[PDB]
Design an enzyme around this catalytic site. Structure first.
Site, PDB file in Angstrom:
ATOM      1  N   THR D   1     -18.042  -1.781  -2.407  1.00  0.00           N
ATOM      2  CA  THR D   1     -18.648  -1.769  -3.833  1.00  0.00           C
ATOM      3  C   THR D   1     -18.867  -3.252  -4.527  1.00  0.00           C
ATOM      4  OG1 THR D   1     -17.065   0.236  -4.284  1.00  0.00           O
ATOM      5  CG2 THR D   1     -17.976  -0.991  -6.194  1.00  0.00           C
ATOM      6  N   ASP D  17     -23.837  -0.665  -7.198  1.00  0.00           N
ATOM      7  CA  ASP D  17     -24.270   0.010  -6.137  1.00  0.00           C
ATOM      8  C   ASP D  17     -23.814   1.506  -5.861  1.00  0.00           C
ATOM      9  OD1 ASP D  17     -21.744  -0.569  -5.217  1.00  0.00           O
ATOM     10  OD2 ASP D  17     -22.544  -0.087  -3.305  1.00  0.00           O
ATOM     11  N   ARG D  19     -23.006   3.171  -2.782  1.00  0.00           N
ATOM     12  CA  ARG D  19     -22.355   3.566  -1.598  1.00  0.00           C
ATOM     13  C   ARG D  19     -20.738   3.613  -1.750  1.00  0.00           C
ATOM     14  NH1 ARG D  19     -23.203  -0.451   3.898  1.00  0.00           N
ATOM     15  NH2 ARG D  19     -24.998   0.712   3.734  1.00  0.00           N
ATOM     16  N   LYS D  33     -21.105   5.126  -9.614  1.00  0.00           N
ATOM     17  CA  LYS D  33     -19.983   4.289 -10.147  1.00  0.00           C
ATOM     18  C   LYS D  33     -19.916   4.018 -11.586  1.00  0.00           C
ATOM     19  CE  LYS D  33     -19.997   2.356  -5.548  1.00  0.00           C
ATOM     20  NZ  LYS D  33     -19.677   1.499  -4.645  1.00  0.00           N
ATOM     21  N   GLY D  47     -12.272  -0.191  -5.997  1.00  0.00           N
ATOM     22  CA  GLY D  47     -11.205   0.104  -5.589  1.00  0.00           C
ATOM     23  C   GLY D  47     -10.960   1.636  -5.310  1.00  0.00           C
ATOM     24  N   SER D 129     -15.798  -5.437  -3.269  1.00  0.00           N
ATOM     25  CA  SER D 129     -16.013  -6.103  -2.186  1.00  0.00           C
ATOM     26  C   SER D 129     -17.102  -7.193  -2.200  1.00  0.00           C
ATOM     27  CB  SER D 129     -15.860  -5.339  -1.000  1.00  0.00           C
ATOM     28  OG  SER D 129     -16.901  -4.160  -1.063  1.00  0.00           O
ATOM     29  N   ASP D 166     -23.133  -7.456   1.579  1.00  0.00           N
ATOM     30  CA  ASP D 166     -21.617  -6.967   1.727  1.00  0.00           C
ATOM     31  C   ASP D 166     -21.838  -5.572   2.305  1.00  0.00           C
ATOM     32  OD1 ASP D 166     -18.907  -6.507   1.317  1.00  0.00           O
ATOM     33  OD2 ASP D 166     -19.400  -5.325  -0.527  1.00  0.00           O
ATOM     34  N   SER D 169     -20.902  -2.549   0.414  1.00  0.00           N
ATOM     35  CA  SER D 169     -21.686  -1.795  -0.622  1.00  0.00           C
ATOM     36  C   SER D 169     -23.106  -1.560   0.156  1.00  0.00           C
ATOM     37  CB  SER D 169     -22.157  -3.121  -1.561  1.00  0.00           C
ATOM     38  OG  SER D 169     -20.755  -3.617  -2.255  1.00  0.00           O
TER      39      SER D 169
HETATM   40 MG   LIG Z   1     -24.359  -3.981   2.538  1.00  0.00          MG
END
Ligand SMILES: [Mg+2]
Ligand SMILES: [Mg+2]
Ligand SMILES: [Mg+2]
Lengths: 195, 212, 233, 226, 196, 222, 204, 125, 195, 196
Positions: D1, D17, D19, D33, D47, D129, D166, D169
């Protein structure tokens, strides 16, 4: 493995050993002979960790057979038992010890006496009129303490042994699938095929 | 895993499943659990796949060296003991094996030795190893006779693996059959459990609990 | 098996049209204590290679001595030691990678993450990573520790794939590296303001810049921040 | 995230994002989100996904009742105070990490909240993250007195850094803009830079491919008359 | 954290860095660790950010309710309320707080409340991870009845050294001056205090 | 405590055709939630018309491939430049792996090529050296996502002929190299959508009697 | 030991043109031991369908709980509950056991009776809603199901085409999972007719 | 909770609430019990003011407490259900703990104890 | 305790349960009846942790007997099994759960059908033609899968049960001291006194 | 321990406290932590007393054998021999050593060798448990090219503060002066340095 018994009477030694072999969940065999003939008048039964038991018994057998050929002479039961004890006493401080308990029944042709030796995996040796390993003694010794006489015949010894096995079959949780019984006397070693 | 082997009048039947799992994930349905040690000796695979593969093809090499030196076929007793003595040296290091060494010689006749990674070496008539061993033992024990025909013995081994494949989650895929004679082993094909189950259900009348 | 005691933080690097750039700060931490403030973590080998090291400093000094011995050994009975048979970046990396994997295989690792930056004989850019586990990989941008999480995202906006390398000048590349070092100083609690930067170019050779500082920092906005929620004064 | 928040001239913008993951597996490719606490108070969560929604709706519900009781539009500091005290009481066990933003009669506000109950104030923030990738962009391009257009650009660029760099995400960028004296505009799928390419093959089966044992009509209707 | 409070002739001054960490990552580089529980009673926070914020909010509530009933509370009273919370909840808290305030009767006072929840009244106090590196410097350089300018320099130089050696401390140096004249906020940036 | 192992992610796929064989793999290398490289080659030409990949812990993977390439070199020296057949290579790799039985190479190995009759061949290994010849085999992170799809679309499992209703199976007709590559690309595209460690790029090595050819395709970079 | 993989099993749901489909295997086991081949995991309350994977005792308990709640809903509301509303009820009910949860993976499927719009949704054990347009998966072979659905699925499939797609997705996923299989059921759901089909599959 | 003392003594030493409870019994339909040499018979009156009654489902006047004990009553019908339920629970509790069914005297002593308790407990009649 | 089996045939349900009770080292009893009659046409066998088994079984018995008296009506086997499941499902999240597995065999007098329900300590209920708990199924299910027919007589069911017990006595390591067998049909519950 | 070495105009001076502890018990209050490995190469010891004594004895042996073959060793050479022992045996050692020496060519030099076994050449060095409390003081007060008297005062004041705050440090302050003139031992008692 599980139950191994021994009794020394007037003129012979009788060894009784269970037939079952269990791999955790299942009973893989119900006719296993947990014994080796070391010399014509000396028999050894055994019980302990899988693999180690047979490996140890056969190793001892080979050594005693080697001695017999070299000297053209049969070692006394006392001499054989001492050799076995030293091997186990050596083993207990090794990298990976033999987890094996044994009974040695022999007839001494010089003294004309039967002899029974009990040795555990630590190398603890005792000469006894009757003996056992594991939980076997817990069920059987009270019967042997009562009925045993030093002047018993072989037939009386077998009858007292039957009473011991019956008590084991009644109060033990495990099914050990009966016992193979062998007699050691002046004429050598023979198996009782009906028990 | 389910592997079995039993002695009878016509020699030895060896039967195994084909499934390999990593947890709940089915890695393979086409695993070979009968190691062809040589044209006369067979070994089964249970426990560690590599340990069984590696050390039983090694066993084949030792058997080949024996017959070159001694000009005579190795006994099943001697062949099994070479393997059991080897794994006993490694005891404690973490090898995982449960295998049946199967063979048919002149002096011994049909012989089976169960060999274990903790050193155990047992001669016997019927052996069954794996997560589905209990299911296969049931069918074997209630239908086994020494005087079985080669045809009926082959079916009994096939049917016993099917019993395990049905109930044991970690057994299945396909059944591999072998028949061991004195002149060598004979392969009796690969049998998909999916197709075999329905075929057996209809022809035999078994598995009434399952709708088909 | 050991634990790292005196440690160095991020090493960052990237490729550009005519060569490679690499950078690392001059700090040697002792846990949370910023103990040693004059530690050089970029170590040049010849005039075509710079090895950047993070992690345990005692192990770094050992690796530094191995590279020094490597140059000596290469010169023995070698008339072309300063020409055709000079040490290449690829030779230096493979040697280090061998050592790192061997040491992890004896369960006694050199507790480091290493980036070898250089230019080959034929002019090709060399940039490759190796760590305490013997793991290796190459990429247009490479970074260790915190740099991996914060520098790479910024450097990848300049060179996102292989085809972006010829389009990237040394001025644009150095600018990106210097900015990344500032960001790491804002956000890494085990970093320092002082750092070293090295450029290896196929035309102008090795340029080694010492005693650089993070500058043009934004802090003024801090004066307006009060309390943690409701506080006004 | 990856979630961010950025202050600007006359308000505040938040982004995220899309995901959501179960370990290494992508559970939903277009997750939402950006949550609404009240019409002009929105928050983004990282989280434990159930916790961030549950805690947002509970406080959002109590904020609505509070707004009706007091006859006043809700304040961001009220949402902040109610969120941190709830999270502190549960000692971090409610794994909610939030960026709370909004406009109210007092002005425009931007806060972050940690699962243990700690709060902080800022002009630019990031969580999740991919917060380090996002914060790298924010620390490189943020300035004082950003315009609305500049703040949306910066916020989405910070989320993109998380998306590409990341593994936690990915997929799309959601944005919500809260300007003073205006309706909050929720821009769902503001950027869509991860559409899947056409497959090489169609996997539509011929009818009758699957083996069937039994067919039957399921009675979904109630008990009938007559 | 690096935090300190120092009494001087005209009152008391609180000082702090602005770094908040989660491991080695600086989660906030511009944090305000100087917190107001009453008009002229402030505190410095170290330890768990959640715990010290929760405590300070409760103390602010207690002193607001005290004021409505009994008038302005003493600094000693504020320290006691802090202590009661820290002592009675010692098993579940990780908080190190310095309480500083200005009365007209008592003038500048400083109370430090370490982990256990004990109270210690002192002429000056230092706390936080970075304080360990300046025990020597502060003990040698502190004097009683300093001027405002001298006290600002003492705190600036002290926290500068704490920041230099402690990785957990950094950012700007915030200060809050408490006197009869009122409440003054000060800020000092890296380019200023690093060259000291 | 020191942990000598790590996980570099990645996913690999080997398929054996009638007169060809492909070994494919993604080019992404990772640790935890970070990307190390978007293009780090994972499938290698080892000579003698053999391609190899050792997926899992990249350090052990690189070590194994390096040692096998070396084994091919010394096979030529010791046996008069004889071509190392795919079956002989497989048995050799078993001994390399089992040599470290009690400190294993933490990888899942796959090799591909042609057998001595010119037919397509793929072999699959576990970390400690057990191996099988196989028709179809995915390995690594997204293996569980890919294999069920291949069972259905390569081996036609659970597919029956319309009208018969379960009585007649769909016949196992042979697939061309173009058809296999389509299934490989669709496998990795789907894996990329649902597994975080899969993406960036797809490199395929095709093996025929003419030699080893390469193909590269982009994958999603998020 | 892990409660979510003691009994085993899987559920999958898909959307099509003016229709939805939901399917499940029939296995119940005690780890390696297969216990039942008739353990259906799909239930329905009016026109709303609920699939539940995971610990079997909780599967049974939750079915009884949602039957309880949807029956009281109907008596008070004087109408059958809709998929969108029921989804929120499942989420609420799961989250109330936040720190002592039911070890399950529920899946909702149905068509809204007023708008006619196809609807599917999934949940984690603790209540988080995953409301996808395309498909939802759950159970011990969820990884395998994700792989099948991601490649086999295309939008706007007709009811009879959707049946083939979801059936092949389930079957091939189950055959790569030791704890799934032993039979399967597929529901095809239209606005005012629902067809239920048992599939023939391998029984190992 | 409601704690009011409803059952209390009066100057002449009477508890009127207990005495008025007997007047409710006087109003109830007649019940009779007769024991023979090897049996007991329970007879009960049904008032014929209520016809169009469904005698299949209407509560019967005699109730089994266990397989070997029965209970009939006169007075308030709703009140008797509470005593019958308590008696049935106690009968099963006795079997569970003593491993023997209740004696008739024990079951009577229990029911009589419950009735007494409701004559000196607060908030109850 | 150890082995409990169940089989539903044409017109009855047959439950078989072991007689042994083992306190670790010794077999304290070899005639224990691991079952309780819940109602005239419903029987429940049980196995699990010591003490909890009988406490649970008797608690259920008391509740069903209470229902029978209150309503003057016997609950269906399905209704009884659901009540038992709920109690175990309630139990598993308690402070100290009942560690008890049960089989419920009943004859439904309304439908004129025998019914067998298997419920484990978690509250996992399944209706089956034949069932077991513990390791009992591992040995017996392959035989039951082969020989079972839905139209079997009671005598054929007993014979198939004997074959199952014989396989248990051959391959199980523990001696469970035989089984007590009980039949549930339209006429009620009776015990087979020779098995 | 509290130990330090400081270079100055005429050479280098080593300093140390005299406290050796086993837990809270002071096993020796008059310990000599300043140790001679060569005529004008000395060291300061911190960490395990067994380890640092064993190391110093081995280094003294190595430098005695070096001298017999190659003449007087450099301070750099002595530091290298210390490092080799500390680095190669890092798993089994707990030693923190400061090496200080005087050459005529190189003059005063100081090398610090922390736990890991790394080497760091510095103008001055501080180590031991008590050093943490004087990082701030030493950084503010150290100058290069100080006089003998100034350097003695710097070390005396520094270790005084380290002793004041660190329970593990205490006793007398020992010092060893290394110059061209020779080797001078100094001692300072509690009554002297406590009143500073
Ligand atoms: Mg990624
Ligand atoms: Mg199976
Ligand atoms: Mg002291």
């Amino acid at each position: 493995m599980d139950i191994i018994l021994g009794i020394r009477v007037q003129d012979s030694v009788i060894l009784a050993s269970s037939k079952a072999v269990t791999r955790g969940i299942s009973v893989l065999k119900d006719s296993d002979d947990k014994t080796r003939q070391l010399s014509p008048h000396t028999l050894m039964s055994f019980a302990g960790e899988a693999g180690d038991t047979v490996q140890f018994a056969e190793y001892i057998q080979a050594n005693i057979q080697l001695y017999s050929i070299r000297e053209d002479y049969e070692l006394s039961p006392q001499a054989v038992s001492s050799f076995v004890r030293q091997e186990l006493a050596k083993s207990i401080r090794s990298r990976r010890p033999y987890q094996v308990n044994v009974l040695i029944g022999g007839y001494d042709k010089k003294k004309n006496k039967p002899e029974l030796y009990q040795i555990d995996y630590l190398g603890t040796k005792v000469e006894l009129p009757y003996g056992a390993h594991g939980y076997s003694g817990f069920y059987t010794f009270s019967l042997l303490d009562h009925h045993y006489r030093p002047d018993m015949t072989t037939e009386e010894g077998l009858d007292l042994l039957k009473l011991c096995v019956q008590e084991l079959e009644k109060r033990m949780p495990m099914d050990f699938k009966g016992v193979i019984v062998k007699i050691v006397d002046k004429d050598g070693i023979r198996q009782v095929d009906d028990f | 895993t389910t592997t079995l082997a039993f002695r009878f009048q016509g020699g030895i039947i060896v039967a195994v499943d084909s499934r390999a799992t990593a947890g709940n994930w089915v890695a393979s349905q086409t695993v070979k659990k009968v190691i062809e040690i040589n044209p006369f000796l067979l070994g089964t695979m249970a426990g560690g796949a590599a340990d069984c593969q590696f050390w039983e093809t090694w066993l084949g090499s030792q058997c080949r060296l024996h017959e070159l030196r001694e000009k005579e076929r190795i006994s099943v007793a001697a062949a099994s003991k070479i393997l059991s003595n080897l794994v006993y040296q490694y005891k404690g290091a973490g090898l995982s094996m449960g295998t049946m060494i199967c063979g048919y010689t002149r002096k011994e006749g049909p012989t089976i030795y169960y060999v274990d990674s903790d050193g155990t070496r047992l001669k016997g008539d019927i052996f069954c190893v794996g997560s589905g061993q209990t299911f296969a033992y049931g069918v074997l024990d209630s239908n086994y006779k020494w005087d079985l025909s080669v045809e009926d013995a082959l079916y009994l081994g096939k049917r016993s693996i099917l019993a395990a494949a049905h109930r044991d989650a970690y057994s299945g895929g396909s059944v591999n059959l072998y028949h061991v004679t004195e002149d060598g082993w004979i392969y009796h094909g690969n049998h998909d459990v999916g197709e075999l189950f329905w075929k057996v259900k209809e022809e035999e009348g078994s598995f009434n609990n399952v709708i088909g | 098996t050991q634990q790292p005691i005196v440690t160095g933080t991020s090493v960052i690097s990237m490729k550009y049209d005519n060569g490679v750039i690499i950078a690392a700060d001059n700090l040697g931490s002792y846990g949370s204590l910023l103990r040693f403030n004059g530690v050089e973590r970029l170590i040049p080998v010849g005039d075509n290679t710079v090895v950047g090291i993070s992690g345990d400093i005692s192990d770094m000094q050992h690796i530094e001595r191995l590279l020094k011995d490597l140059v000596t050994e290469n010169a023995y009975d070698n008339p072309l030691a300063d020409a055709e048979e000079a040490l290449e970046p690829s030779y230096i990396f493979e040697y280090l990678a061998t050592v790192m994997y061997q040491r992890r295989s004896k369960m006694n690792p050199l507790w480091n993450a290493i980036i070898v930056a250089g230019v080959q004989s034929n002019g090709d850019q060399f940039l490759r990573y190796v760590n305490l586990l013997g793991v290796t990989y190459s990429s247009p941008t490479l970074a260790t520790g915190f740099g991996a999480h914060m520098a790479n995202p910024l450097l990848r906006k300049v060179v996102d794939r292989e085809s972006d390398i010829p389009k990237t000048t040394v001025q644009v590349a150095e600018e990106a590296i210097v900015n990344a070092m500032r960001v790491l100083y804002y956000r890494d609690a085990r970093s320092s303001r002082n750092f070293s930067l090295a450029i290896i170019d196929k035309n102008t050779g090795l340029t080694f810049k010492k005693n650089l500082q993070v500058e043009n920092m934004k802090w003024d906005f801090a004066k307006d921040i009060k309390g943690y929620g409701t506080q006004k004064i | 995230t990856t979630i961010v928040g950025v202050k600007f001239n006359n308000g505040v913008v938040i982004a995220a994002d899309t995901r959501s993951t179960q370990g290494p597996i992508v559970a939903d490719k277009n997750c939402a989100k950006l949550h609404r606490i009240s019409p002009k108070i929105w928050c983004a969560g990282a989280g434990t996904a159930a916790d961030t929604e549950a805690v947002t709706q509970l406080i959002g519900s109590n904020i609505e009742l509070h707004s009706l009781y007091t006859s006043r539009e809700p304040r961001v500091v009220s949402a902040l105070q109610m969120l941190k005290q709830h999270l502190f009481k549960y000692q971090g066990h409610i794994g909610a990490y939030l960026i709370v933003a909004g406009v109210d009669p007092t002005g425009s506000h931007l806060f972050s909240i940690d699962a243990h109950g700690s709060t902080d104030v800022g002009y630019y923030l990031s969580l999740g993250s991919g917060s380090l990738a996002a914060m790298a962009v924010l620390e490189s391009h943020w300035k004082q007195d950003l315009t609305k257009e500049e703040a949306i650009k910066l916020a989405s660029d910070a989320i993109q850094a998380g998306i590409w760099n990341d593994l936690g995400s990915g997929s799309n960028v959601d944005v919500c803009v809260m300007e003073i004296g205006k309706d909050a505009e929720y821009l769902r799928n503001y950027l869509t830079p991860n559409v899947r390419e056409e497959k090489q093959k169609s996997y539509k089966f011929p009818r009758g491919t699957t083996a069937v044992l039994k067919e039957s009509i399921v009675n979904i209707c109630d008990i009938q008359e007559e | 954290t690096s935090i300190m409070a120092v009494t001087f002739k005209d009152g008391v001054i609180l000082g702090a860095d602005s770094r908040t960490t989660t491991g080695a990552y600086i989660a906030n580089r511009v944090t305000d660790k100087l917190t107001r529980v009453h008009d002229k009673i402030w505190c410095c926070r170290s330890g768990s950010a959640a715990d010290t914020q929760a405590i300070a909010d409760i103390v602010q509530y207690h002193l607001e309710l005290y004021t409505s009933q009994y008038g302005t509370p003493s600094t000693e009273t504020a320290a006691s309320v802090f202590k009661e919370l820290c002592y009675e909840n010692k098993d579940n808290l990780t908080a190190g707080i310095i309480v500083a305030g200005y009365d007209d009767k008592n003038k500048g006072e400083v109370y430090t409340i370490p982990l256990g929840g004990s109270v210690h009244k002192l002429p000056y106090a230092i706390a936080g991870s970075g304080s360990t590196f300046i025990y020597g410097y502060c003990d040698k350089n502190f004097r009683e009845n300093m001027s405002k300018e001298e006290t600002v320099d003492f705190i600036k130089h002290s926290l500068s050294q704490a920041i230099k050696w402690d990785g957990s401390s950094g950012g700007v140096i915030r200060m809050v001056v408490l006197t009869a004249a009122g409440v003054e906020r000060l800020i000092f940036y890296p380019d200023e205090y690093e060259q000291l | 405590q020191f942990n000598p192992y790590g996980d570099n992610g990645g996913t690999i796929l080997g398929i054996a055709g009638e007169d060809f064989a492909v070994l494919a793999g993604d080019t992404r290398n990772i640790t935890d939630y970070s990307i190390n490289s978007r293009y780090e080659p994972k499938v290698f030409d080892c000579g003698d018309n053999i391609v190899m990949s050792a997926n899992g812990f990249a350090a052990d993977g690189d070590a194994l491939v390096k040692r096998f390439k070396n084994s091919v070199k010394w096979y030529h020296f010791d046996h008069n430049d004889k071509k190392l057949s795919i079956n002989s290579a497989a048995r050799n790799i078993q001994h390399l792996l089992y040599g470290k039985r009690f400190f294993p190479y933490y990888v899942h190995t796959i090799i591909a090529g042609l057998d001595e009759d010119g037919k397509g061949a793929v072999y699959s290994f576990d970390p400690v050296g057990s191996y099988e010849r196989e028709q179809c085999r995915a390995g690594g992170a997204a293996a569980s996502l890919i294999m069920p799809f291949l069972d259905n679309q390569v081996n036609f499992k659970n597919q029956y002929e319309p009208g018969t209703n379960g009585k007649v199976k769909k016949p196992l007709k042979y697939l061309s190299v173009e058809e296999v590559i389509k299934l490989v690309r669709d496998s990795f595209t789907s894996a990329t959508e649902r597994h975080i460690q899969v993406g960036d790029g797809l490199e395929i090595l095709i093996v025929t009697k003419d030699g080893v050819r390469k193909e590269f395709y982009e994958l999603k970079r998020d | 030991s892990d409660p979510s993989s003691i009994n085993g099993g899987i559920v999958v749901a898909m959307t099509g043109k003016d229709c939805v489909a939901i399917a499940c295997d029939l296995r119940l086991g005690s780890q390696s031991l297969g216990v039942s081949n008739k353990f259906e995991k799909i239930f329905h309350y009016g026109h709303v369908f609920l699939g539940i994977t995971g610990l079997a005792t909780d599967v049974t308990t939750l079915n009884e709980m949602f039957r309880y709640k949807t029956n009281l809903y109907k008596l008070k509301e004087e109408r059958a509950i809709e998929p969108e509303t029921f989804t929120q009820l499942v989420s609420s009910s799961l989250y109330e056991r936040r720190f002592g949860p039911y070890f399950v993976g529920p899946v909702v499927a149905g068509i809204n009776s007023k708008s006619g719009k196809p609807f599917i949704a999934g949940f984690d054990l603790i209540g988080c809603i995953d409301e996808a347009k395309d498909f939802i998966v759950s159970g011990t072979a969820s990884d395998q199901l994700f792989g099948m659905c991601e490649s086999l699925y295309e939008p706007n499939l007709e009811p009879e085409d959707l049946f083939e797609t979801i059936s092949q997705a389930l079957l091939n996923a189950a055959d790569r999972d030791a704890l799934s299989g032993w039979g399967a059921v597929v529901y095809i759901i239209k606005k005012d007719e629902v067809v239920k089909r048992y599939l023939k599959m391998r029984q190992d | 909770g409601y704690d009011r003392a409803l059952s209390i003594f009066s100057p002449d030493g009477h508890i009127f609430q207990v005495e008025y409870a007997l007047e409710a019994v006087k109003r109830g339909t007649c019940a009779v019990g007769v024991k023979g040499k090897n049996c007991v018979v329970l007879g009960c009156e049904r008032r014929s003011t209520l016809k169009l009654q469904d005698t299949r489902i209407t509560p019967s006047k005699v109730s089994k407490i266990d397989s070997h004990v029965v209970l009939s009553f006169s007075g308030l019908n709703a009140d008797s259900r509470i005593l019958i339920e308590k008696a049935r629970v106690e009968a099963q509790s006795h079997r569970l703990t003593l491993e023997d069914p209740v004696t008739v005297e024990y079951l009577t002593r229990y029911v009589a104890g419950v009735q007494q308790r409701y004559t000196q407990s607060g908030g109850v009649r």
